[PDB]
Design a protein around this nucleic acid. Structure first.
Lengths: 188, 153, 124, 260
RNA sequence: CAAUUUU
RNA sequence: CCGCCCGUCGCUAGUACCGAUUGAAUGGCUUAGUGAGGCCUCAGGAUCUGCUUAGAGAAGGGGGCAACUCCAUCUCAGAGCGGAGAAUUUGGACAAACUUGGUCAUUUAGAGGAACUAAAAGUCGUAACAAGGUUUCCGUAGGUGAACCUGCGGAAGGAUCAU
RNA sequence: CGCGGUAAUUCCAGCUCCAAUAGCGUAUAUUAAAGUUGUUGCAGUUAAAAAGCUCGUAGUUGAACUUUGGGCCCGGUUGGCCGGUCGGAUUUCCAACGGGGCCUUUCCUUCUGGCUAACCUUGAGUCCUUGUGGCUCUUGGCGAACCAGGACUUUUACUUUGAAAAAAUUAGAGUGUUCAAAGCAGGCGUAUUGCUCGAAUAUAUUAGCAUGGAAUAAUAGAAUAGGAC
RNA sequence: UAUCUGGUUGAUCCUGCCAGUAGUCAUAUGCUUGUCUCAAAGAUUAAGCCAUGCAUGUCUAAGUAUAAGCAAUUUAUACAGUGAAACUGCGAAUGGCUCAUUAAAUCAGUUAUCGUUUAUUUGAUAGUUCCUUUACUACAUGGUAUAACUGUGGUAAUUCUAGAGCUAAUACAUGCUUAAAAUCUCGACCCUUUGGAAGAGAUGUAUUUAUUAGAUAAAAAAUCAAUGUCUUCGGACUCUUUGAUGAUUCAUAAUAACUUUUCGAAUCGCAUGGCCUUGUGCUGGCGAUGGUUCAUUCAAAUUUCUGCCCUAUCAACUUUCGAUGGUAGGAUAGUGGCCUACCAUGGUUUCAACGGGUAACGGGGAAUAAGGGUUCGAUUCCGGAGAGGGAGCCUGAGAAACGGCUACC
RNA sequence: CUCUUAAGGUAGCCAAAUGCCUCGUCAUCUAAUUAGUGACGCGCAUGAAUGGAUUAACGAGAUUCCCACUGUCCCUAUCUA
């Protein structure tokens, strides 16, 4: 086991703590998950007090917002693009928190132009009732839909990959497009 | 340890669970959270119109001051984003019936909304441990030395 | 384990160990009463010297307090109660004045001769 | 270390039990607490410390198993069940209905009541807030949580309860001019009824407390516990009457009340 | 000016 | 003062000190390397399995000359879809244990050398105590069997409180 | 310390005596004695000791003065009173006193809300012997005798009180374990199916926690006024 | 019971020590030995080694029993008893021992958890589970997978186990229904409209995100854009909720979705009821368990303030083998250099850091006693550590357990 | 004191490149060492500018030991010009 307390680890003034209390169980951390892609190979540990935590490697499907309200459309993940912490997980395809993922972006403009059907920009009695009631709404932004031409768009993660066994992020918004489209783009 | 439109580093920095709608565009253009501190403490004025994010902030970030409240004075602002302060205090010893000065100094993280120097009589507040040594955060400077913007030459 | 039993020894020998005018004042005192050894004339003088060690620190205290009032008129009640100090010395300083033969007149072997009844202190 | 210590021994006890030391052994450990901390009272100490009916530990074990002795309407059919504050104790035939209150010195009583007033407790409400499924919940002294209270009682009051359903009947306020029966401190339970309180905010809060003996003393807020308004009292008030009259005169009145 | 011991 | 005391040397006993052995042993942390075992993990898949069986090894029927690919009875079959799962096994961390280098501390062996103390019996002298007979003491340099002596600058703790 | 070198008052014995006594010597480490470790409380010419002398940051210690003197009222304790009463008495004043609030040129923190609380407000009615002396609805009428809010009071040391400081042990009340060390119990009624007191109290340093004082020891803003309502 | 005596000289007065004196829960030892009343006892060094015998199991009426025992009744003719086992459930993590390591470390007081997880004790709390949400197919009640046991074995031994024959459940694993209103996305249809409406249905909770709400000082209006309950229609004008903190993105509610689905009974004992629609019509009590959340206790974890003997013949100590911070991620039960990537160069210190010694477990506490002390405290209590020496471990709410395991010495 | 023919080895040093007796004796190193080292000294016959005693660097100087390295050896084989 690997410990987590500071009974080792030279103190503030530089004095060594000659260590007592060889390591116990209640401070135990353990080896990371360092997740992957590849369709739902998850195990399950049991731990403190009687509790579940889901070890997650090779996840396949998340859910991602507008994020005007939080629609959470069912969405498969595709790959790994860019990360703040290190260049560890770009060329190993690990998706962590605060990461950048391309997902598929195909059911969204499907939804955005079947529930609206605008249709931008590369009938029945109810679309005259309920779609026509929601007129003057579909104006969104250019650089959030200028990537809705080739087929795919970016997203970030804001759920815990390896502990909770899940992956529930959101596609970026507004200025946070314009930040990460300055981060990774200064390459060629 | 920062300046210059404080978004600085390899991640984007923003407050969690905060969302201004990009489709909405009013004349305020601010959805920046803050709170009230407690203890009869006012929150400072620049902590409402700030630009720093830095979660270790006492007011805008995520701490809650709930411990033993102390008071001291600054020995250095040369340490980056955190300050070490000196407390002097007497200590009676019963054998010799006389006092003796022993001290103990404290490091303390500070809000970027304060600008302090060596000296600068200051009180702090005990918070959940932001780093290894530090368990404290500043609350108000009140550096009432001489010449509060006085001297001409 | 069960509790500690608490117990104390009850006599303290004098500190200049032996000289003539100390030992002769023993033998005429402890011989006309005729007592066993120095284990008992020390142990009454022990608790005699401890109650005066108790008394002259509340004597350092003033009246109208609790302690010189409350237990102060309780041991001087108790010294009346033990038959040692007579019924005219309720004055909080004469307890410091009493000395030996007064912790001796109210034991068995001396008092029973005082009612006749024993013909001696060694028949007693 | 490694798990909860279930053996304590005498000469570590909460001394208001008043257990001697020549029996002096592993103490009667309370069960898991229904109400509050280890200032409680187990059953099998009370039956042979002051009530003085039990002789052997197997004999008081041969009492509570047959559903004999009852508490709060229930029986609590295991041995070392703890006792809260102003707990009612329903007895069997010959009807010796009891009640725990604490004396002028922190010790308990030898107290007996009638079946009148023996149907309600007074609980120190301390955590009232609203929980899931929208319900406002309330807590009591024993943790007997009660659904859908009267909103705006306040925090830190006492309430008159049902002890067959939840159903608090009559609450009371807490202002300047009440009657207070404090518990906790060197001077618990005289009465103080008020003289003042302040803010003291964050650290503690203080209540200034003065009985008919008209000395005033100050006690932290978590110990104070009202049982009524000025001249109210709800309960069968004990025979030491809650004064703590001083050291000399109690000896002086026992010099008088024995009738010499 | 010669000069040192003496159980 | 026929007082007392000072050293060298001779014997008798004992005390630590320094010692060649690129000394030794224990312990602390380390120096580079070796890596057990139990873990997470990529695989692994032997050995048990389930819904479905085209046909029949078997035989009995949706009723009938056989009148229809069905209850009939085991697995030769197609495998479709899976699951449990032992050995083995890739990669990471924890690293017990081990080797080599240091450093520090603790004890310890060691041929011999150079002191010091004690007992007074000594053998050469008599420097010190009188002005100890050459006044005496402190630094310092040199000689000197031995205390010692001598050169210098001091000082009186003297042998002068005085021209 | 000295005894013993032909009678040892010290040796070995016999008698006698002294000591403690159911315990008594010895051995080692300790505390008092030791004011031979010293803050309270050492010595420093000759007994051991004052730097060869002078700078010097520490650290320790550092001239003085920054509101006194009052007068008035109010009640508080204790000892007294011909004692009036039988260690109980004490209205009255005295003495010893201490505390608050005023006027003293006068800090007598700033207000927001309902309670405040009262007439000085107020029609007067007066159910009444005195005509807000016994009470009533009462206007700008005292704004807080109380909670919860803005507000920010140079910063400490000290000290009063209270809380805390597990409990046993150390004290200490009570209690005839036959006495005591000890325990914390017991004590009495009818013995005709019971009455009842207890199991006190105090110390428990320093560090905090609230709580009054402002002498004592420091501390800061109005010198260029970027001062103050 | 705040105290002193012998000894430097022919005699004196002093500094000054040596010795004598007294006490020790402060240990052995010599001699001697009548009586009660309570008790310290292998800490001193060798936390060195252990032969042996024990020290931790358990059952009611209320889990499972065809003992192929004994009951032996009266129904208990499937059977209810006492049950030997053996599965299933809780205990074994508390106790009891010792002091080896361990100088801001433990520990004493003092805070805090808005920075966390809970086995039970107590208190409340799930009609909706059906997507075949109409071949649910049984809920008037399913499946296998097995123990003791039977009969066959090996090895010399060990709490060593095999193949074969059935077999159980609060064990595993599935599984549908309980009344009921109601809110909302969508829309059979026709008819064109302020568009109405059948009905496709989602509607218990948890896990994971995204979002919103979670009020407030002095009181009313003017202009424009859609532009009303009644309707003199230039008109009366909006009705409207707030928990709690000193302080929150808190508690909570609803959205838009997700989940190897977590959750909601296929269980037992006494009494035997009520009502007629006299039939498994229908109600039909109390225990004994057990499960989702939220509090109480038991806890456990960190955790700020001060306090820790001796040595400068230890003056600098730390940082690529994290030192001190920031950011981002992991991991935890949970904050944080606790570990990693990047960036910065700091942090303590003559108020004694760092290093070394300790015959140093800390404290409450002992012995001594004018005042102020000095020296102890391994040990009758509190708390920490260890179970030859280190290291890693699965079960379990809780072990880095050692009367549990694996490896090395 | 004493005698030759004048004064009799001082400080140092050693079985040393000076010591036959000699492979002096003691301890260490290795299984074994007449070789080393460090001590002893009445030294056949050491010794003070015929210079004595030390000593950092350096040496195609002499010498012993240890670590790595190898046909020097066991124990030889083979190939090329």
């Amino acid at each position: 086991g690997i410990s987590r307390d500071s009974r080792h680890k030279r103190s503030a003034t530089g004095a060594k703590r000659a260590q007592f209390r060889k390591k116990r169980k209640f401070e135990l951390g353990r080896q990371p998950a360092n997740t992957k892609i590849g369709a739902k190979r998850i195990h399950s540990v049991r731990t403190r007090g009687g509790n579940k935590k889901y070890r997650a490697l090779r996840i396949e499907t998340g859910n991602f917002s507008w994020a005007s309200e939080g629609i959470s459309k069912k969405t498969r993940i595709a790959g790994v693009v860019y990360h703040p912490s290190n260049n560890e997980l770009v060329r190993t395809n690990t998706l962590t928190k605060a990461a950048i993922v391309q997902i598929d972006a195909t059911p969204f403009r499907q939804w955005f132009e079947a529930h609206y059907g605008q249709t931008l920009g590369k009938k029945s009695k109810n679309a005259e009732r309920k779609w026509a009631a929601r007129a003057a709404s579909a104006k969104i932004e250019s650089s959030v839909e200028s990537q809705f031409s080739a087929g795919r768009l970016y997203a970030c993660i804001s759920s815990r990959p390896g502990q909770s066994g899940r992956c529930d992020g959101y596609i970026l918004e507004g200025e946070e497009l314009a930040f990460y489209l300055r981060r990774l783009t200064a390459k060629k | 340890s920062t300046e210059l439109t404080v978004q600085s580093e390899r991640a984007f920095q923003k407050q969690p669970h905060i969302f201004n709608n990009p489709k909405v565009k009013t004349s305020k253009r601010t959805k920046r959270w803050y709170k009230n501190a407690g203890l009869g403490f006012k929150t400072p004025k620049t902590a409402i119109e700030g630009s720093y994010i830095d979660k270790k902030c006492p007011f805008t970030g995520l701490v809650s001051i709930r411990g033993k409240i102390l008071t001291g004075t600054v020995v250095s602002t040369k340490m980056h984003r955190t300050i070490v302060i000196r407390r002097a205090y007497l200590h009676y010893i019963p054998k010799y019936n006389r006092y003796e000065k022993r001290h103990k100094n404290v490091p303390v993280h500070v809000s970027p909304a304060f600008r302090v120097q060596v000296g600068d009589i200051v009180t702090v507040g005990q918070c959940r441990p932001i780093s290894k040594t530090v368990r404290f955060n500043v609350v108000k400077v009140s550096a009432a030395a001489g010449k509060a913007n006085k001297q001409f030459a | 384990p069960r509790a500690p039993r608490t117990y104390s020894k009850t006599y303290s020998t004098p500190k200049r160990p032996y000289e003539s005018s100390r030992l002769d004042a023993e033998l005429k005192l402890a011989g006309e009463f005729g007592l066993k050894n120095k284990k008992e004339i020390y142990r009454i003088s022990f608790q005699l010297s401890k109650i005066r060690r108790a008394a002259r620190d509340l004597l350092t205290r003033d009246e109208k307090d609790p302690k010189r009032l409350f237990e102060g008129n309780a041991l001087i009640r108790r010294l009346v109660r033990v038959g040692v100090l007579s019924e005219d010395k309720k004055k909080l300083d004469y307890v410091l004045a009493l000395k030996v033969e007064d912790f001796l007149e109210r034991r068995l072997q001396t008092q029973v001769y005082k009612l006749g009844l024993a013909k001696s202190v060694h028949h007693a | 270390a490694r798990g909860p210590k279930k053996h304590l021994k005498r000469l570590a006890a909460p001394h208001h039990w008043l257990l001697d030391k020549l029996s002096g052994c592993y103490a009667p450990r309370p069960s898991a607490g229904p109400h509050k901390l280890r200032e409680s009272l187990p059953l099998i100490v009370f039956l042979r410390n002051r009530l003085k009916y039990a002789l052997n530990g197997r004999e008081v074990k041969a009492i509570l198993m047959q559903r004999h002795v009852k508490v709060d309407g229930k029986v609590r059919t295991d041995t070392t069940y703890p006792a809260g504050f102003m707990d009612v104790i329903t007895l069997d035939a010959t009807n010796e209905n009891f009640r725990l209150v604490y004396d002028v010195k922190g010790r308990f009583a030898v107290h007996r009541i009638t079946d009148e007033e023996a149907s309600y407790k007074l609980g120190k409400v301390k955590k009232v807030q609203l929980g899931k499924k929208g319900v406002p919940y309330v807590v009591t002294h024993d943790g007997r949580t009660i659904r859908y209270p009267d909103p705006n009682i306040k925090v830190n009051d006492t309430v008159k309860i049902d002890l067959a359903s939840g159903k608090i009947t009559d609450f009371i306020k807490f202002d300047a001019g009440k009657l207070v029966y404090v518990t906790g401190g060197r001077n618990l339970g005289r009465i103080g009824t008020i003289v003042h309180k302040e803010r003291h905010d964050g650290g503690f809060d203080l209540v200034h407390i003065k009985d008919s003996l008209d000395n005033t003393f100050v006690t932290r807020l978590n110990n104070v516990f009202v049982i009524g308004e000025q001249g109210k009292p709800y309960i069968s008030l004990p025979k030491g009457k809650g004064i703590k009259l001083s050291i000399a005169e109690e000896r002086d009145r026992r010099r008088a009340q024995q009738g010499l």
